[model samples]
Target chain A: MCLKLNLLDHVFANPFMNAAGVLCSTEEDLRCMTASSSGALVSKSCTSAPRDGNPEPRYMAFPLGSINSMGLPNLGFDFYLKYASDLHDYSKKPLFLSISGLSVEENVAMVRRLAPVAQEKGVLLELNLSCPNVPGKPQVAYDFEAMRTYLQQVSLAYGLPFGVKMPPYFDIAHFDTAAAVLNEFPLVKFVTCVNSVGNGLVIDAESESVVIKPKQGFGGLGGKYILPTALANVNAFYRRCPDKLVFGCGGVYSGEDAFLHILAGASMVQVGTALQEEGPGIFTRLEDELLEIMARKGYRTLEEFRGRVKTIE
Target chain B: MCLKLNLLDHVFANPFMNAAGVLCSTEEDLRCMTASSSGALVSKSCTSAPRDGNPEPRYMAFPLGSINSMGLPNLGFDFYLKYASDLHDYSKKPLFLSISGLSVEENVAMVRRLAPVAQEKGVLLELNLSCPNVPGKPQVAYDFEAMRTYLQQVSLAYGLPFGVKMPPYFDIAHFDTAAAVLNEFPLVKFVTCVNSVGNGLVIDAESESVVIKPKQGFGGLGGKYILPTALANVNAFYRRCPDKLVFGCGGVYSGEDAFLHILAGASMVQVGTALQEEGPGIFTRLEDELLEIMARKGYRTLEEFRGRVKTIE
Candidate 1:
């Protein structure tokens, strides 16, 4: 069975923690999520050293989706070390550690620090390789050779089972290549298919100008608009590698939407936009609605329809 | 039984249209309504004269709610007259006309012009008396004397059944007084409890400033936070006068939320903020969920639960 957990407190926090050129999700923000129940708590992507992200107007919203250019801002590995240890005692839910690094040495150093903690605390770690907001850097996951090199280096350095998180690129060739490359490494446990698409903006019709004045007029799109795209990506990955674990993210606003993601082939689903729109109550509402829907659809467990497609063919 | 046929196209063209600082239901917006399936369309609120509401930062998000200060912008009764005739062709749904005015003369003039079209088109007219953005004006429904005078003048001016819409204020004394005043006008068909709460803002912690740079740091709070307050107000009114028809508005995001409004004694419910949060698809989702919930609960129609609260008491 595929078990999934969320690292950020709310959907709005997704941009802050996961991608580069995004806002920062902090412990203070986690209080909002603590008020409600989430499957698991995932920490913000951490690096070996502290780094400040891009300047303001980092996030923007469109009709169907939103985009953000939040450069990955983190307080580094030491900060997570100080905070992650105590988070378990306060929140009984399992914690997933997310780590990001620019070089092989830095990536391995992060794993070395986190691996011991993960084994002791029964936590899982996630490797993020698709952040697009980092200045002057092409997304590593989108390049076949670079992705393979990094995945191999990191896999060798880490003892713990870790998943990789990537942004949703329109092209699937890169994902196909990355999936093949990561499959060679047994330590690469799962894949988080699709982070937010970068930089979306909304314009005021009367003024013929942007609603939010940002350095870059773009952000990740969320809510209903991105659902189909997210589903297609998840289905593609799941179809290609049936046994491999895949987690889906994007545009999930309700239990029905989440259920649809599962039906589309996501072993597990992450809610980033919906939680931002609805609030902490979203988790419970989604869970309750899902339970009700499952009862109505005669679903006994999440596994019954992990990727059960309704096909006329 | 209380029947509300909205001649919305007559008031604000469509449901997606906004008037008097409130968003009306558009055809696409109404697709999710249970009432729409049963032939009901409530138009956006309109006024006798044209209005240009507050500018940007009109809306913002909170942890559990949203705040908006639309400033009651509308395109005068002259524009509404041109659109009012369109209601004749909306055979798929019964129309409810939402009407508002700045002065008694204006209110009388608006009703005089629109009531004939409503009669001709077989629609019901709703008087919106609790607009929060109007400058230096007491809500007509909040003050017993003003409400009594306005209702009497407007009812006499137009030979159509009209309802008054109010806000969910903490003061029960005003409600009691208003109810007594309204009792004198038996022609008044229904009462809508609660428009959005007025004026609030969300501040960004990172910037150490308000997220929305509004002249006034407040706007009406909507979404889930208002549910309990709206229910309490509606229930209170329903208990005082079982004979009076009550329509509930505030924080209805789903079919379950709509059903809860009915259970709390609303003869019908108006969805405003939820429409803003989810968009047009909300109506369809709400209708499907309502039917599912109804089927599960063994209730065939809305009437089964409408105002059932008195029985429990």
Candidate 2:
């Protein structure tokens, strides 16, 4: 069984994968992951048209984590769709096509065009629901009624199983509310808990100024800063949405962090900041670390106890 | 001319303070913070009826931060009120009384009674707007109508100035919605951005179980795990609520973290996990570190740069 982690009807050889926009915007990015040991790879979230993103220094890394306000930079949907249809090697590893449209109408348009191509090509689709459109509306997911409405329209339009990338919800009632909205749509089979924590300002002490050049130095934060919240979002959705699966994201820098996510009820894990920091080769070290942990814990396959973490009575 | 952080008409000696529920649950807890170098102390959140919270191990400290689902355990309102009206020494650090009732009526009842005493005694009142009473309703602040109504009742019932303790928000829209709700209340003079990141699960890989006891090992997260998100929330509200002041909480492990919060537009910084790990005396180190950074930056007063952080154009 090794590190097999199942999603949909597919059995992944391992649970490792890239979170959207990390090593995933180009054919070269996708090929590199396939050549690496990652169990799966995701495309960068695509828009209907190419975006210029924010500006220089839009991304930066730190020892603990990284920050970015890339502003949903991506190749257009057609580029990613064509790449999967022509260049993707499914037998080598599963690939997920991630899409982030600027609006509900745009999202529907992309999903409508991509769904059939994805079906023919065996590439799974992940809608980037955490994309905060304009500042006034927030992300589609944070507004309860808006999310519910968007899901209704998009799920009905897609007419196939897909996943949604989520932003972390801090209150229990938000988990309940978001879960209730997600549960209403049976086609939203999987929930990717947490996007990069949104809209943070990192300052340089010497200059006393914001670090990133986008949104006035406001960007998303990732890495160790988000692990607990990441685990929380995963477990909350896992428990609240009984019919759904949760793929974990955020704060994954090592095997221990990955192992901790599986115990918290993730069927699979994706890396962002760590992957960015260490590059595509980090997967092998992560897998070895997971195996070392499993060996010490006296476990065989990940299935032996995956998602069976205990809580005190 | 020093780092005097002002609230309403009161000018604090420094920006150091304890986040509610850390060393503020009992009279003993209150006194410890009062005696410490902390510029201010906030009382533990009180409900109408006393809550026992979760069992032992409900709160556990980590090298990175800490997790707890203490379930809002505290002595009832009267116990704290008597402490305030009878025992509190105003010559000490300014005091903030935090109240979290199970219902709007309960909160209003406490505020109605407590506000007058607070005004007479020169104490500040902070209403925690994160509590969600009914299951589907979400937290008071998460539910715009609920919080708007909550503030309308509590702030008016007390007929005085008070502050609010907010849950960390991610979306720019959420900041707008929440700040809009807050702005509707002229009496809501200050906003404390972020309680602990709610509903986080910490796992001990050695045991394949969650570390905390409450909510099946699901608890509130604090410390380094929430720094970026904490700064995001602080800055988000600071920009949106031009009429209000923001007090920063979460991820304040070092003087650098505190310095970062002030840079992110927080007028004061509150410590939770660090305070938990180091006890009340952590205040001195945090204050010293903030001043050290301040001195290095050639700033003599907090007002020199408070809320002066720049965003790239």
Candidate 3:
């Protein structure tokens, strides 16, 4: 059975990859991901400058999933860019360099720097419009006007097709408005959703206190807790944006989860909390498991069942 | 520890109750709940007329949560009102009759009928502004204008103070707007958040099929999956609407969940999915668990720690 599919003008061996901010933050992390059997890799979301981020105990795992408020910690935009250039120059899969900025100016600055070398280096861009953990900073994707303004500036500066990582939108009207704004930007080629269910609070029963240390234990939730929501957003955008692609993030732990993402119209599937918990070895197991499901169902290719999730109607 | 508290001019023995719609739909269900150790009781959210609701296989449970598209099945408005009246006249407890309508006219009609006997019979009203399962009918709370319109008519017709059951709002701006609108009406005495996270689609990978039957298997999510969201909304309204009381609903399966709700500023806590799964016997367990926690913490009364959730700052 062939698992390969074409995305961004290149053939991907599979749709599995690590969600940004999981294990792709450090050099060792990236090397492990690159060595793993996954189809693609994405850099940790970076801001203009390096950050120590929120204090310790900012992330915790629960029975349903995990909560985190990492506060966009990264080794700065320059480090990821240099790494991307190095990988593009000598060896590569589809290496997407993710960039997150505190302000529009900082984001455009990074986009401009990438524009000159993007095509030559074969480096893909993932513009993160939603980072929920930063104090006093609202996720741009939730505020439609701000999202549009950010996209307009980035589109003009980069002059290259890019994707925006988005936060989960619950209401249908929100989905409609969010998709409408994205539809206006031709340079926005794909959309990756969602960047965790934001501002979730987890408490310890015995301690009678919040679980995580950041923001009074208020953080973003990912993994199984958000699978249903993740699927809803993926399908909502897929149906809304016919001209663009959809990347599903949040709550993917196994091949079945990956299969559901593809069936729900996600061109690519990303793993976050599970990857952080299980390590790169998870990639091989996911590949084998996904293949096993496909074989049992008599599917020879990913496209056969891709975006074919049946509705009750 | 003393769990008793005064709400709506009546002393509640505890803060535990069944969220409208779980184990409160029929005569037998209501009897069981009334016989339980819960401090308050609410009827199933009823429409103007009786409903058989959606087709079979309309509800399913998951590890982290449960999903249902029951489509507002109920014994109708008059039946619940009569039951509420019967309970109010002789039997005693804080009995809240919940009413949901597809249109403003229908809601106002029911509100008018209840207003006449409301004070005399000591019956309470819970205006359900959010019901996600009904096809083609949007949850009123998501659309601020529609919600305001409904409230305008109900406030005028009822001529009495009441509460509203709301859906979860993820974005801060939404919380601000929703709270702002509710604050405008002085007649709205209490706010119960939330009425499940809406439009969630659950999939069964083994069969490669959606779980529920209505609206293509899209339904409302409850239980542990929505605890954080529920607490967020409960706290959002608690902070925003100083004049109104807040009731926490969603994800209360144990005493710890109820304890967290009160700590987050919920005057009362309601259980839904867990109640449906475990039956009324769960109430005694929750009460016991809540008391145990309170005792270990050396708390003598509910008011001592209610709404005292701390932030990391």
Candidate 4:
């Protein structure tokens, strides 16, 4: 089936898009993404103010995957909010502003700042509650009570429906707990399935030290490294949060990967490591591959089989 | 380098063993493992009493991996303890007894009944805190405080150094919190990095139904699906718990997988999906493949580079 889709009131031309942090870190990068063959463009998650992030050598692409501890580096919230409000056209694709803050006060302030105006301007809000690279602060989504409070406050302050990005959860109870928390807020709309598997140490056997300098070579792992956990999370949330939409993130290198995510219940898929390794050109290839896969499977539309994965007895 | 290992004063001729709950569920299954080339045999992670687990179609092997919600089925603690104490040979290989009770009370009770005696008799213990299929229970390790409580009570009652089986943790804060909890228990000598990435859904797209009977198809994922997360956990604990050892579990289908685990600082590695899919005989092939890899890399012993994965700057 074709990848046409709807997210809230927005109509996506297709489901392929760039995961935040891949190519959305700069104005030029965002411009390139808007020009790509994707249905959506997400801004690099930003804090209330500019963040220098960790140290250099923060990102590296490996054969099977990639690792980075960029530490939520981004221009301030104002930079991204202006980028979103100033977008001249919404006819082509959706623009998502991912807001990440080091503290609840910062996050709540930004949400209130952007949501009221951005909602009227057709800018979508996606809270980044799960960036592993940041040190000393827990990702917002991992703290149950904290995330619950943020959603409640933002839903009221922003007065708009929005989405949340989450880290992969390894236990069912966590899925139950987190899903229940999101379920509590009626305005908590779409749920992005996963952030990177955080704080993985990739070592070079020749030199018995870490790969990244910040935090002693520890970094967030992306790409093929996260597909399983990512898939598990996407599907787990898909099943548990039946009332909410799930935008799949993590481990999308090709159309086949996209198909798996969709079958497991992702309405949209985001790409990171693959895009970092190969540029934004991946969108064109992914669209072609996804189309081919759908055609081969003899499906005529996404709704026919989207989120229809069954277990064999 | 050739593979030789020392874990908790017990030397392993090779560092391969079946992950708890693979093929060592019964007397016959345990006997088969005893006669196999695997360096160790871990009994099924048992509870206070026998459990029937979930139901049929609980396990299914896929192309890239496999999934299951076996619900920690076992023959009960008494059965495993008897098997551990009756072991007539320690020189052949080590015997590890894994206990996964339904509650903290049950867990402590079992440790009191089994551990001290078992340690003196050359048996090892690992507390399973990551079983995800239980209907109403939380995976013990996910609740940091609860895990801390378990470690304190169990270590005291057991009066011995033991290990704890864990679920993969995706956040750095979680890693820090969990590692700190383990470190506080001086007798917590080893940490089994990862049980399985729990609560994943596998869809048979043709029919829009769930897989396993338990939890409406939610299950634990293993094999290739878990390699990256597994590697990260192995390395995460290996680097964090400096005073302890990490026995890598998850996604070891071959020699290269095993090598990666060791290079990530795991002194020993455990197999589940591969052993379940290929049987204990896979060890012979794994040994050959590992030796070949070591020789090709010009290493002579496991110690020369074990726990020495360095990151590239």
Candidate 5:
């Protein structure tokens, strides 16, 4: 069965890749994703400057999922940009350069800076519009007006096709509202469905305290806890915005999970919690497992069943 | 250690009970709740007329959680009213009569009819504003305008304190919007933080089919998949509506889960998926576990630490 998918005029060998913020901040991690079985590479979300993120115990993995308030920790924008430019020059698999600038101006600055290299190298710009752990700064994607301004400014600055990484939206009206905003920008070519279900609180009953040290233990949730939500968001955007592609993220642990994402209308599936836990080897497992599932279901290629999940009437 | 709580002028032996729509839809179910170790009794959400709900396979239990598009299946308003009235006459653990009328008029009619009985018997009214599986009917709580109308009409007709059961909200802006709406209704004495996360899809990858039969496998999600969301809602409302008590529901399976709800500001915690899978006796386990955790933490009562969860600075 063929697992290949085409995005931004680039062909991916498979749909599986690392979700930004996991194993993509450093050069070694980026190299690992490049060498691994992943069909593409996504860089860590970069800010205007380097960040150390939150304090110790900022992330924890539970039985069902994982939570983190990693506060956009990255090795700075220049590092990822340099590496991504080099990768684009050297490789066929695409590199998604993720940027989550602290403000609208900062985001525009990053976009302006990346426009030249990104256009020439065919690197995809994934605008990180919803980093939930940035302390007092609100997630840009949650407030539609602010999100519009950010998108408008960045699109103007870059003049290139880009994708916006969104936080999980639970309401139908919100889905409509966000999709409307996205539709106005033709430069917004793809949408990554879900950054994380933000501000989730996990408490330890034994300690009578929160699990993480940031925002009273409030953080973004990932892993199996968010699979259903991930699928819902992916399908929601896929149904809502006909002009753009959808990248599925959150709770994708296995090949079956990846297959579910595809059926729900995702052109690509990105792994986060499981990838952080299992490392780059997970891409191989996911690829092999997806192939087997596809073979079992008599799917000759991904597009044969992609976005074809049946709904009960 | 004392697990007792005071809410709506009644004393609950503990803070744990059955969430509306589980193990309380029938006379036998209500009887079991009254006989069990739960701190209170909640009737299944009632409609203007008896409903068979959605088709078979409308509900399914997974290892981590459960999904259901039960579509308000109940024996109508009168049956629950009769049983609740009888139980109120016979018991001290308060009976929460849940009503999810299909329209504003239907809800008002039920409230109007129940006013005298509810006032006389000290029965609590739980207005289910968010029933996710009702096919075409949008969740009442999701629309602030509609929610205000429902609260206004219901409060005017009933002239008694009631509570609104809400759906999980993911955005901070939404939390603010919904909480602001609830704060306006002082007659709404308590708020149940979360019904199921409505319209979530769960697919069986190998079968490439949805698990449930209703709404094409889009149902309300419960259990561990929703604990973080439930806690977030509970805490959000607890902070927002100081005038109202909060009831915690969703993803509550263990004693520690119950403890987390209390810490997050719920005066009462309700169990759904766990109670369904483990039977009414699960209440005993939850109560015991909560007591043990309380003792371990050197707390003698729930109020000492209730709504006292600390945030990292």
Candidate 6:
């Protein structure tokens, strides 16, 4: 028996917008995750309208890591709604609908439209405050005041449990401040930490040009290489904000990786890039390996190890 | 649904010795072909005694393919009997217990031991005839008369269905002679075409040494690169022996890969290295992908595409 955290249950109960851009691209991809041991499905960060993500060379492969610039390519909200209804049929797991907006009003409008839809389907919404790939303005996550106001306004407007997804900023000195802001908002349920570290690029030696086109060549690197950094951030946040729930997201490729994240204080680990490398099968493989690991460790469920680390400092 | 023809059933109900080294060393690996999704499970090629196989770096990776010199590592016949019985408690799927021998009598003795155990557990026996890694004079499989006599003796001794597992030899002309030897045995079930292409190696340029080591600097190649070659061999044998059922082995990584082998004339395809790369989850993933592909192609079942291709010579 494995411990179940029901990560999606917490997110669905919240009203904050769930980010859409990372892994949730196709219905099949979403279906794979929902059918997995994970509790909820977070759609790829979708825009108000449909857009064909990035071009064919959207993904680059490396030995221990990979970089991808999907450019938020999605089949608009209208097209997503068609499949979103199909998600209603998935009664086994909760669905956390992710919505994005260019401006404050756009974001609010997206939430207003999504809340009813998600309510009808018994799905939750998650606000994406930080999208590294988007150009022009600063990400809402980087600004404590703006983020606090945004969370307060969104929380007051929506009547559901919602949360914010943030990036792994270089200087985490202000992390406590940010966490405090979300804590001030009573409606916010949890925080999803460390969206893919970005402004990445892969260049071809022969052509001496960037391998992928978009925003003058920038992307996010994920895989085994990012595991260390992501775990550190999650551990730090867990240490600082014991009251807030944190969902760890990064280079989680196997059950061992997930266990390590949980030990480091993450409520749940979000598996992304490994799926890109190994495909949908990675989920079940990880789950089986995790179960075997659990049985061997004499632990019956995930809760046994959930933030069970002995803190020295 | 995917159609998988049970080679062990077809062969065990007939007569002949097939290759056995391809059997999985662990029960988990064995399930890849047999109990998980396929109609049967082929036990790892067992020895009279247990062997540790080769140490780590037993397999080498390459851009196009991989080579593994696993050295017929197995838990021996005794462990296999226990594992087989354990499987009986959980899965009723047909088990294809593959056996290997160092000598004619050893092979006969192994057959005598496993055949009854298999019958008791509703498992079938497959006699492994070709093991290229083993060292010996005249290597049992190369000599047509010796091989023929061995098959005849084994058939008379066990009265169990048997199939021959043959490797692809450089001398294509000798195939007919090998096939003719089986013509004498009316009870021969079907043929499993090809085993791992042997003794492959990969050398690291910077290290100036063998990148991966098993025994001697070589192993077998399996994955996407070997698909075309494996298909051709299965097709050739299918054409040569239309009545004999043919099981294709080597380089099957996905449902499409399995379907391609069937279209090329294989009754079913066996997977190994890909499973090692992806883990046990490959079974359900392959099955799901195959079912989706079948649905898209308007093929109702595995039978519709099984050897459905027509060619005018």
Greater-lDDT candidate between 4 and 5: 5
| Per-candidate DockQ vs. reference | 0.01, 0.70, 0.45, 0.42, 0.46, 0.01
Error of 2 at B137 (Å): 1.7
**TM-score per model over all chains:** 0.46, 0.95, 0.92, 0.90, 0.92, 0.47
Worst 10 residues of 1 chain A by lDDT: A10-19
What shift in Å separates residue B186 of candidate 6 from its native position after superposition? 92
Ranking 1 against 3 by TM-score, winner: 3
Selected candidate, larger TM-score, 4 vs 5: 5
Which candidate has the highest DockQ of all? 2
Please give the C-alpha DockQ score of model 2. Answer: 0.70
Per-model interface RMSD values are 25.8, 1.6, 3.0, 3.6, 3.2, 23.5
Worst 10 residues of 5 chain B by lDDT: B131-140
lDDT of 5 at B217: 74
- Evaluate residue B48 in candidate 3 and report its C-alpha lDDT on the 0 to 100 scale: 86
Ranking by TM-score: 2, 3, 5, 4, 6, 1
Cα lDDT tens digits, model 6, B1-313, are 4344335433221111112444366765555445354444567777788878777767755544556666678888887877776654334355566766666777777777766765666666566765432343334565566687678878887776667676543223445566667667766677776676433333332232444454334345565434544665676667667667778776677777666667656765677667666655676777777677777777776667666543211
Clashing pairs in 3: A223-A251
* Ten-residue stretch with the least lDDT total in model 1 chain B: B11-20
Report residue A62 deviation for candidate 2 (angstroms): 1.8
In model 2, the Cα lDDT at residue A171 comes to: 76
lDDT of 4 by residue, B213-283 (tens): 67667678888767766877888888789999998988888888888788887888899999999998999
Q: C-alpha displacement of A145 in model 6, angstroms?
A: 2.1
State model 1's lDDT: 0.59
Q: Compute the DockQ of candidate 6.
A: 0.01
DockQ of 1: 0.01
In model 4, the runs with Cα more than 4 Å from the true position are A116-120, A131-137, A204-210, A296-298, A311-313, B115-120, B131-137, B204-213, B293-298, B311-313
Model 6 ranges off by over 4 Å? A7-23, A35-38, A132-136, A311-313, B1-313
lDDT value for candidate 4? Answer: 0.81
